[PDB]
Symmetry: none
Subunit: 46 residues, 35 copies
Amino acid sequence: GVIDTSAVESAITDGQGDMKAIGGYIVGALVILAVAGLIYSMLRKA
Amino acid sequence: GVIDTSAVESAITDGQGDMKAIGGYIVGALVILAVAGLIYSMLRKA
Amino acid sequence: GVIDTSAVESAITDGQGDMKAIGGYIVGALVILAVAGLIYSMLRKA
Amino acid sequence: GVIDTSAVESAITDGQGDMKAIGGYIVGALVILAVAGLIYSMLRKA
Amino acid sequence: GVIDTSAVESAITDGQGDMKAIGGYIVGALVILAVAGLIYSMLRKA
Amino acid sequence: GVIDTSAVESAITDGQGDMKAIGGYIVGALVILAVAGLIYSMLRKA
Amino acid sequence: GVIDTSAVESAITDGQGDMKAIGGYIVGALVILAVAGLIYSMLRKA
Amino acid sequence: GVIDTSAVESAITDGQGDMKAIGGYIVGALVILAVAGLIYSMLRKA
Amino acid sequence: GVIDTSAVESAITDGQGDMKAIGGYIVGALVILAVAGLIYSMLRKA
Amino acid sequence: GVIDTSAVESAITDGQGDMKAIGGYIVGALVILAVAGLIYSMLRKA
Amino acid sequence: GVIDTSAVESAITDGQGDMKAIGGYIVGALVILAVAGLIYSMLRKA
Amino acid sequence: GVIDTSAVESAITDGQGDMKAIGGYIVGALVILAVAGLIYSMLRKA
Amino acid sequence: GVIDTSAVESAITDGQGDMKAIGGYIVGALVILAVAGLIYSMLRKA
Amino acid sequence: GVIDTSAVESAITDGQGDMKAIGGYIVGALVILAVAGLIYSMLRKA
Amino acid sequence: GVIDTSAVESAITDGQGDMKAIGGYIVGALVILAVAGLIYSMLRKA
Amino acid sequence: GVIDTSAVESAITDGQGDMKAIGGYIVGALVILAVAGLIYSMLRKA
Amino acid sequence: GVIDTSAVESAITDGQGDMKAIGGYIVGALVILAVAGLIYSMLRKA
Amino acid sequence: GVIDTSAVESAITDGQGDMKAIGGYIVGALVILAVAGLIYSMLRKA
Amino acid sequence: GVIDTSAVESAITDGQGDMKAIGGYIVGALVILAVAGLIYSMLRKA
Amino acid sequence: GVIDTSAVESAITDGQGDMKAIGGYIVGALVILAVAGLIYSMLRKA
Amino acid sequence: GVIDTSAVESAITDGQGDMKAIGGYIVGALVILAVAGLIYSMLRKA
Amino acid sequence: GVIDTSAVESAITDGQGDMKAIGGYIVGALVILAVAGLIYSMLRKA
Amino acid sequence: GVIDTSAVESAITDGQGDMKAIGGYIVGALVILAVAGLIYSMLRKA
Amino acid sequence: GVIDTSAVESAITDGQGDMKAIGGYIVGALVILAVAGLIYSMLRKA
Amino acid sequence: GVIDTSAVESAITDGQGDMKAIGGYIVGALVILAVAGLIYSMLRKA
Amino acid sequence: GVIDTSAVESAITDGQGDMKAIGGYIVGALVILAVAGLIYSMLRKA
Amino acid sequence: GVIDTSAVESAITDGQGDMKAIGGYIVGALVILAVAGLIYSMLRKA
Amino acid sequence: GVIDTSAVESAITDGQGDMKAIGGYIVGALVILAVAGLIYSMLRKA
Amino acid sequence: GVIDTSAVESAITDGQGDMKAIGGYIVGALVILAVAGLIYSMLRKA
Amino acid sequence: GVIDTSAVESAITDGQGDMKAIGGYIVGALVILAVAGLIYSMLRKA
Amino acid sequence: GVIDTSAVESAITDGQGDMKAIGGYIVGALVILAVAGLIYSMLRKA
Amino acid sequence: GVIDTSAVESAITDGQGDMKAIGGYIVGALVILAVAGLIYSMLRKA
Amino acid sequence: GVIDTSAVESAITDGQGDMKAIGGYIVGALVILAVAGLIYSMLRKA
Amino acid sequence: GVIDTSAVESAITDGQGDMKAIGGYIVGALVILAVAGLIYSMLRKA
Amino acid sequence: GVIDTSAVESAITDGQGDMKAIGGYIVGALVILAVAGLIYSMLRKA
């Protein structure tokens, strides 16, 4: 008997690996929103 | 007479054993989702 | 005359005996599924 | 006959146990959001 | 003639008996989800 | 038959219990904002 | 012939019975959210 | 001549008799599943 | 010759009869879910 | 055949019934906000 | 030969019939939400 | 010579005759399942 | 088939109806502010 | 020799014939679900 | 073979039809808000 | 259906009611300023 | 639709009405100053 | 498809219509201030 | 069936109750501003 | 030998054919939602 | 295969079309505010 | 796309137009003051 | 509902009260100027 | 063996293709909102 | 001796052959579902 | 349920408390202006 | 992939374009105020 | 003896092979959704 | 069961703590404005 | 006598042997599903 | 195994790319507001 | 990332540039007042 | 059995960790707004 | 695991960086106002 | 947890720091006005 669930350990890892990519790159675009909003509020201020 | 259902006791155990692997490693990827979502909500916040 | 169906009484009993094994050990693996699913749903929740 | 659903009682308990972890630690991050938002509103105020 | 389906009456009863266990204990973990979600929504609220 | 949804009655109650905490303590910080704003307006006034 | 689906009539009723509990107690916690939000908006108002 | 198939009429009747037992008691356990599922869905709902 | 499949006509009818019971009573519990959900959404609304 | 969806007609009605309660009583608190704001603006005016 | 699937034509029709009930009455409660929300927004407006 | 297999022609016909009964009446109970399932899905829907 | 969205036509109308109330009565209080401000400026003038 | 499997050609055809009935009428009830869901989403929208 | 998805073409159309109703009538109430807000701002202006 | 926006009609009225108070009493103090200024100018005159 | 800005037409009119009062009565006191100044200059003259 | 934003064209127009009222009548009261101020300055002059 | 939205009637009432507190006490501080401003203008006057 | 799975090629094609209908017509109703939402947001905007 | 998202191209266009209406007509009312404010400031000036 | 800010060009122009009116007519009254003051000083002179 | 604008009635009164003080005491110093000026003119006279 | 998932490669591509349409055209309507809002803020400004 | 299981080799092959047909054509209809779902989610998105 | 808006009663009170400070001390500096102006006018007088 | 945010570049430009219009024409009316004020001060001067 | 499960090793591999296709191409369409949503949120932002 | 909302009690407290900082230090800068304005008015006075 | 069931021991072993192949390789394709689903959920998330 | 989330890296980048466009061009219009406001305040000044 | 706030540096500069214009030209008119006042005082002198 | 939700404890912590970063750095930019606003108000003051 | 919120640290910094630009350059224009106002007051003085 | 509002303490301080600059330097120019006015009054005196 057996069952090599070793290709899982690996394969799942890539899964996390890509979500860090999506997870990071995603944020990169929320900063543009962010800062562009501080500035927008600086100008309308004075 | 007899019937050695001892290879079961064992063999099934591996079954659980691998599901803890899938069961754990699976969660590892739900945290990436999770945290990447707190941060996403921190940035859009302020 | 006669017919010793006593080796049956016994032999069948083992039959039940092993099915409790399969029957129990089997469930042991449905809990791993179970709990690993509550947790999976806790994380995706918040 | 029988069926030892005692490994369930236990195993499920851990399930709750971990969800209190996820459940608590999760909130720990909603306070950071929270307070960081009161302050954000104090500054923009005056 | 006969057929003692009395060991059934009993044996099935345990079946229900254990499902109340699984049935209850299962819910115990859906409350943790539940409440942890009210609170999560209280904090993000104000 | 049965289903002890008594652990709910309780468990949910804590849920409300904590939201009164969050609910109160939250307000404690909206007063600081509040008063600090009356005063801010008193000074700029005269 | 027959089939006593009378234990259903009953057993299902409890089902509704408990959902009124969950159904009510659940709402009890949405009011805390609610009111705590009117007040939160009263203070930030003036 | 003859053939007393009267012990059949009877003996078969018990057969039905026991299947009503199995048939009923069996259902008793499908309600536990049932209700425990309505409640499970009430909690996850709100 | 013959074959009195008249006990079927009847016996099956009860079958439908009970499924209307299960079929109705079942729905009775989906309304509790339903309404308890409209209200839940009314409160969180305003 | 049949299916008494009459307990729905009723049960849903209560649903609306309670939302008028929440719906009305909710507004009662938006007037306090409202008027308390006209007055707040009368005083700061002159 | 044959197969009277005429009791279907009918029986299914009731099925639609009741879903128009649920389908309509359901909406009746989404208007209460709706309007109660326009008004809620009128008051907080001025 | 001969062999009157005419009592067959007939006798078999009844066989079909009863299976249309079982065959129809059987379906009558699959509609109850059916419709009771559309409705069940209408309610949980909205 | 169908769907009586006629209770909407009506129900929404009341919605507008009440907002004219809030909408009008609201203004009634902005005139008091208004005039009380012309007069306030007449007196401080001479 | 022979074997008139002509009563099949026919008899099976009815089989398809009725499944178009069940197949169509069945869908008639999935539209009610469908549309009643677009509308449900229109109202909750604005 | 076949499948009359013609009752769909129609039935869906009504779906759109009603959403134009909800869609229009809904807006009718956003104008009341709108105009009542221009006027509110005219008065507080001078 | 309904929505008793009658508690508004009333409640808003008080709003105006109090602003007449603030509105009047406010002026009472602008006369003191006023007259005290005519006199101040009479004396410095001759 | 509508918006009765008729209570304005009126209410504003009173506004003018009172300013004629303040406007007139105010002048009444500038004549006393005036004449009392001609006389003051007549006496100091000769 | 469609969307009758014709009730807007109209409804908004009234909005302007009333603001001309407020806009005009408002000025009517700034003239009283105005003239009453020329005269006030004529008298104090000589 | 049922749904005790009676704990709402009450709970919401407190909501209004506290907003009268915030609503009143808030004004208490706008008078200090107010009067302190009349006096400030009396002194700078003469 | 053989097996004319040619009536499949065809019959399945209709299957796709109807899903394009459902698939298209379905979208027709998501645009009404869509646009009616842009407009809803235009009005509440200014 | 296919998917006629051509009814979108169109339908969305109307969406823009109406927002130009709301968008323009909306401004028409901000000019009345505007000019009525220049004049208001001309009069109070001299 | 577009935005007809042409009704502005016009509407604003009237704004200037009326301020020339107020602007001129206003001066007409400062001459009366003026000349009436030269004469007042001629008489008191000799 | 309510709003105790009674603390205003009072609080404003003090406002007038103090302005009579400032208003009177202020004049006390304009007499010293006054008389000291009659005398100054008596002496330089003869 | 085989499986021509080539009709996927294609068919999915159209999927993206249409979402660029919806994706673009959608934005076209967010600019109208956008600009119409800059202008709205220019006018109310001066 | 012998046994020509050569008509099998062939005949089975057709079996696979047709399942590739069913297997492919089947998928063709899961893409329509698929894409029609991406688009459905694009529209409801913005 | 509850909501201790008692920390408000207090906290707001301090708010008034400090504004009396600012409110008083502020005036202390308007007297210096005041008197220093009577004297300035006494000296330039004679 | 793609996303033609080119209709933005353009559309926004018009936005600026119109604000220069409002921005300029607006000033045209502040000069009338301006000059009409120099002259007003020249006349009252001598 | 034997059993060439080698055509499996291969055949299954294609299975994975195609799911990477579906798996990838599928994502290609979730990015369009994604980005088109960042942009949608950038525009509505400022 | 449980939920340690104790890290909230604390964490929120810091929130208030920092707002007292911002709240105080903020005022420190409104005094500079204040006093620098009394003096500015003393000098321009005499 | 005898019976060499030794070719079984062996032959069956291969049976298990191949099922590990099918058993493993099968899973290899459930991971592709799995991961491709985490990622699908990451993208739609933010 | 694999999953080419490389088309993401790219595709998301464009997302940021366009938001810099919207982000910049957006600001271009807040300066027009800005400067047009300094000038507006220069003119009304002197 | 980035944000070209370079169009600001420039655009603001023009802002100052025009205020020097308004700032200078404005003064040009205060000299006319000035000198015309020295002369006015020379003539009335002797 | 088991389930190592230890990688959560950790992973979530980073989540908070980064939100303190976003949470702090975010505020750093609200001070620039803040102070730049005190100064802006100092200059326009005198 | 991880999440590189390092592109934030940076990106936000630029945000502050640009607000110092807007923040400074903005003030540059409040001085022109300022000084141009001292001078304006010097000339009108003598 | 935490929140370093230490960069505030500092940053705000500079805010005061610069206002002392503006606050002082501003006065420097009110003395020039002042003295230049004493002298102006000395000369016109004798």
